[PDB]
Amino acid sequence: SLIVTTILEEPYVLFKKSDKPLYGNDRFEGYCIDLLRELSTILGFTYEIRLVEDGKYGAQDDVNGQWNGMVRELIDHKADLAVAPLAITYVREKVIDFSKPFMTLGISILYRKGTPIDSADDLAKQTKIEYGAVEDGATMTFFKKSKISTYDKMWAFMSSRRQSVLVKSNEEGIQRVLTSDYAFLMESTTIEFVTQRNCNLTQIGGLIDSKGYGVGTPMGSPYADKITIAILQLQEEGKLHMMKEKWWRGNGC
Amino acid sequence: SLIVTTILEEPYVLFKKSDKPLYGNDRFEGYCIDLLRELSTILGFTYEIRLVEDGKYGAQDDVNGQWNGMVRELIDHKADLAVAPLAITYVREKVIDFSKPFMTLGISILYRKGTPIDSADDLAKQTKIEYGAVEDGATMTFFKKSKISTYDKMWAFMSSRRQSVLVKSNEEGIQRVLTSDYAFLMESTTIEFVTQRNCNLTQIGGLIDSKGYGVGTPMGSPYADKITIAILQLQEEGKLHMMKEKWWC
Ligand SMILES: C=C(C)[C@H]1CN[C@H](C(=O)O)[C@H]1CC(=O)O
Numbered sequence: 271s272l273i274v275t276t277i278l279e280e281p282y283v284l285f286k287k288s289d290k291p292l293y294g295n296d297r298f299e300g301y302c303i304d305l306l307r308e309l310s311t312i313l314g315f316t317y318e319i320r321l322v323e324d325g326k327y328g329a330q331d332d333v334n335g336q337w338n339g340m341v342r343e344l345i346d347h348k349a350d351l352a353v354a355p356l357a358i359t360y361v362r363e364k365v366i367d368f369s370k371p372f373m374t375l376g377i378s379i380l381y382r383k384g385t386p387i388d389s390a391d392d393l394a395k396q397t398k399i400e401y402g403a404v405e406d407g408a409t410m411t412f413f414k415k416s417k418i419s420t421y422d423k424m425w426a427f428m429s430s431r432r433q434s435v436l437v438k439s440n441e442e443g444i445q446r447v448l449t450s451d452y453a454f455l456m457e458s459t460t461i462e463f464v465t466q467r468n469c470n471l472t473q474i475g476g477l478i479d480s481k482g483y484g485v486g487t488p489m490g491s492p493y494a495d496k497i498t499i500a501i502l503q504l505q506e507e508g509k510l511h512m513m514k515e516k517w518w519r520g521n522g523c
Numbered sequence: 524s525l526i527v528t529t530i531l532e533e534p535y536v537l538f539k540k541s542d543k544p545l546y547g548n549d550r551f552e553g554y555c556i557d558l559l560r561e562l563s564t565i566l567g568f569t570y571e572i573r574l575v576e577d578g579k580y581g582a583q584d585d586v587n588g589q590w591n592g593m594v595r596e597l598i599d600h601k602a603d604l605a606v607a608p609l610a611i612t613y614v615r616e617k618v619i620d621f622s623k624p625f626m627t628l629g630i631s632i633l634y635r636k637g638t639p640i641d642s643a644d645d646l647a648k649q650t651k652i653e654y655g656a657v658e659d660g661a662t663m664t665f666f667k668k669s670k671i672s673t674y675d676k677m678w679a680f681m682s683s684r685r686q687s688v689l690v691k692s693n694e695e696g697i698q699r700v701l702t703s704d705y706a707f708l709m710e711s712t713t714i715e716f717v718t719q720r721n722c723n724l725t726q727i728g729g730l731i732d733s734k735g736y737g738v739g740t741p742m743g744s745p746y747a748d749k750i751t752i753a754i755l756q757l758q759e760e761g762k763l764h765m766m767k768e769k770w771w772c
């Protein structure tokens with residue numbers, strides 16, 4: 271039996287709606303839960319899903335270098351797999367292993383329709399429209415590390431305003447877009463889910479970078495390569511595409 | 524130095540043009556050549572580029588189970604890395620290792636603009652317009668194995684006409700599109716290169732699947748993970764994007 275760490279994030283992992291309390295694995299559904307189920311069938315393991323205690327994905331404390339979130343659970347061998355929209359990044363790959371990607375995406379901008387804002391550069395060169403990202407996530411880290419003029423400028427803006435423009439979650443960022451003059455730097459996969467459900471919102475510009483989500487494992491785990499092969503099987507038979515359609519597809523904007 | 528196996532395929536790998544003779548690695552240019560140079564810089568290795576003798580990527584013969592191409596070079600430890608638009612696939616991952624993807628893509632359709640054909644389904648339902656793929660590549664293999672009705676039908680059509688509709692190169696497929704009534708099933712990255720240069724051609728429909736190109740290594744090689752890390756660094760600093768813009772109406 272494997273211990274699988276994960277985190278609530280629509281539509282990847284959600285609590286099933288129910289009149290009565292549910293228990294154990296029965297509590298959860300979503301794209302990542304379907305993925306876990308499919309992987310379990312192919313590779314023949316059982317599992318217990320556990321929400322990560324600190325509610326974090328995994329970032330390094332910039333003073334002591336210690337990790338948190340699902341990444342820390344893996345490093346500490348508290349979990350066997352992390353199954354979530356966990357971006358494969360340079361810093362994380364140095365401390366844990368990942369399967370090859372089950373989904374590909376990039377940072378982009380969530381904003382309202384009908385404005386003159388067409389790119390990151392348009393946001394960077396002003397301050398009236400505030401903008402931000404989830405604190406300490408892969409998106410924020412991209413900006414923190416970027417040497418590109420536009421993105422460095424955006425980092426200077428966000429970091430100096432971290433108290434007011436950085437958010438704790440996608441949900442908070444999305445609500446900020448809906449209720450104030452704010453543009454949210456966020457992952458394109460999640461943007462697509464949002465824009466299918468709110469016709470007044472749109473992605474602005476294209477993808478600013480490229481990354482994949484992968485299943486995390488402790489470094490050296492034999493499951494990283496096994497899951498890669500299972501993911502390739504699922505992709506090549508069209509299941510990953512069906513899985514995405516199931517959890518994303520909206521009724522039109 | 525590491526031995527790096529590769530293959531000519533525009534704009535990934537080409538012979539550099541010069542008025543004077545060129546030697547060694549200097550003979551080559553392209554996206555993958557730039558990639559290799561950058562990987563070299565980060566990881567601190569020297570290397571020798573060699574074109575794969577049999578001019579194949581890597582497929583398994585369904586009679587004797589023998590592999591060929593760059594995949595075979597890696598299996599036999601004749602090369603340390605394969606750096607090319609080499610698709611990461613289930614069957615290849617069973618026999619060699621791969622870095623994580625430096626490019627992501629999918630099978631799609633290259634055809635002419637201004638036609639009624641809007642999807643694979645539209646091709647499958649007819650026979651007047653021929654269609655095909657590079658023989659024995661990842662695209663053909665996708666169709667050969669698929670259980671999705673539309674793709675299974677397309678495979679049945681292609682296999683019954685393989686002498687006439689399967690081609691030996693992307694170049695041959697493109698020439699087929701240009702000189703006959705033919706739609707070519709090919710990788711979306713390469714389609715983008717072609718359509719930026721041939722204004723009468725276009726991608727039809729979306730991506731039929733999703734895959735990545737990765738650097739291949741013999742199975743168990745320590746370089747697969749090292750190259751993954753270097754690729755992630757290159758991506759995050761915007762270098763892969765710059766390289767794409769450089770090499771890619
Ligand atoms: C839901 C959020 C906090 C996660 C999801 N993937 C990114 C990560 O793996 O860090 C984070 C989003 C982002 O940074 O835009």
Ligand SMILES: C=C(C)[C@H]1CN[C@H](C(=O)O)[C@H]1CC(=O)O
Binds near residue numbers: 581608609693
């Ligand atoms: C250039 C061709 C022969 C290669 C490139 N990638 C695919 C591969 O890795 O097999 C092949 C193309 C294709 O199958 O459409």
Ligand SMILES: [Cl-]
Binds near residue numbers: 295318
């Ligand atoms: Cl349970």
Ligand code: NA
Binds near residue numbers: 363365366489
């Ligand atoms: Na790792």
Ligand code: NA
Binds near residue numbers: 621
């Ligand atoms: Na492998």
